């Protein structure tokens, strides 16, 4: 669609690679309006980071996060 109508607020340039699995406090799924598959990670430092969804370690991080809180 056009620009006036957009529910995408997150754009990722790069991805975080591997660590760690304990620093995370919450995670958010990227908006559909973005059209780009990405995961948002909020750590204990209240810092946000981009992470590629199709990663072996990501699927293992979301596990601990979803199970814990």
């Amino acid at each position: 669609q056009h620009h006036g109508v957009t529910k995408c607020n997150i754009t990722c340039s790069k991805m975080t690679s591997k660590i760690p699995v304990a620093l995370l406090i919450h995670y958010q799924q990227n908006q559909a309006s973005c059209g780009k598959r990405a995961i948002i990670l909020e750590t204990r430092q209240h810092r946000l980071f981009c992470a590629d969804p199709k990663e072996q370690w990501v699927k293992d991080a979301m596990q601990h996060l979803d199970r814990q809180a």
């Binding site: 620009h3 006036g4 109508v5 607020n9 754009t11 790069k14 309006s33 948002i40 980071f49």
Partner: protein, 288 residues
């Protein structure tokens, strides 16, 4: 590391009220004015010339365009599920059709004045059909990629090549701005250059009308496309972008895009509402 996400939430939250308001305005004056065009023509004077055909078609394109806006405002709130494909389709088709018929006005009057080529209502309807079809084929790359996912209108970029948004921006820039503006400017320049030296006593008003057309077109479409250009420059990696720059560019895009939508509200006052035919007197004068 540095994969820190560039958040855009505040920009959207701030742009939402303005966009909603402007959409409301455009729907108001647009629907009113253009339906008024159609009514005025259809009853006060059944199509007497090709100009009337093109005017009705222009008002129809504008109506179709503005009637999509309430749906978009309903979209902006609560992010109801209505097909994205069809709405985007009507959006871009109506837009491109509006631009096309705007060009066709200048063309028709150009061939009418200088080269003295005259088209009956029949041919005008034919060409109108042509323009609508051409408007649909040129809108295809703008809505055929749009789909509904998670109750949101999205363009799956990962499934498309990186060249696509650039090509789309370029096609929009030259197709919606460059080639209509160039044509209407050339045509109205020739027409004005002929009428200024014409025998008609009050040639002036004709020129003023045409000038007004061009000027308005510019002051409503140029900001948007000029933003599109630097956006393309960002996508083309010709310039460097920071998070703040991407934000500012986003805001600019949204706002100016909303600005460009009022042009269809100005269209009734530019051709149909303008008044008596000072051009018809010149028309009778040139037939000698």
């Amino acid at each position: 590391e540095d994969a820190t996400p560039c958040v855009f939430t505040d920009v959207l939250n701030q742009s939402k009220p303005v966009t909603l308001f402007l959409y409301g305005v455009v729907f108001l004056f647009g629907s009113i004015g253009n339906f008024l065009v159609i009514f005025t023509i259809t009853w006060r004077r059944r199509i007497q010339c090709s100009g009337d055909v093109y005017f009705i078609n222009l008002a129809a394109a504008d109506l179709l365009f503005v009637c999509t806006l309430p749906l978009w405002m309903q979209y902006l709130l609560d992010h109801a599920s209505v097909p994205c494909t069809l709405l985007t389709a009507c959006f871009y088709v109506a837009m491109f059709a509006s631009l096309c018929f705007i060009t066709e006005i200048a063309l028709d009057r150009y061939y009418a004045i200088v080269y003295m080529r005259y088209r009956p209502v029949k041919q005008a309807c034919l060409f109108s059909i042509f323009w609508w079809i051409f408007a649909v084929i040129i809108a295809i790359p703008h809505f055929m990629v749009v789909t509904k996912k998670d109750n949101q209108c999205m363009t799956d970029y990962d499934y498309l090549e990186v060249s696509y948004p650039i090509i789309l921006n370029v096609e929009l820039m030259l197709g919606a701005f460059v080639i209509p503006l160039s044509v209407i400017s050339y045509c109205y320049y020739r027409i004005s250059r002929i009428v200024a030296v014409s025998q008609s006593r009050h040639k002036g008003r004709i020129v003023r009308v045409l000038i007004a057309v061009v000027l308005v077109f510019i002051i409503f479409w140029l900001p948007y496309h000029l933003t599109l250009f630097v956006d393309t420059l960002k996508l083309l990696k010709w310039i460097s972008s920071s998070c703040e720059f991407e934000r500012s560019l986003k805001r600019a895009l949204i706002l100016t895009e909303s600005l460009a939508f009022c042009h269809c509200c100005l269209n009734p006052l530019l051709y149909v509402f303008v008044g008596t035919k000072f051009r018809q007197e010149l028309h009778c004068l040139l037939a000698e």
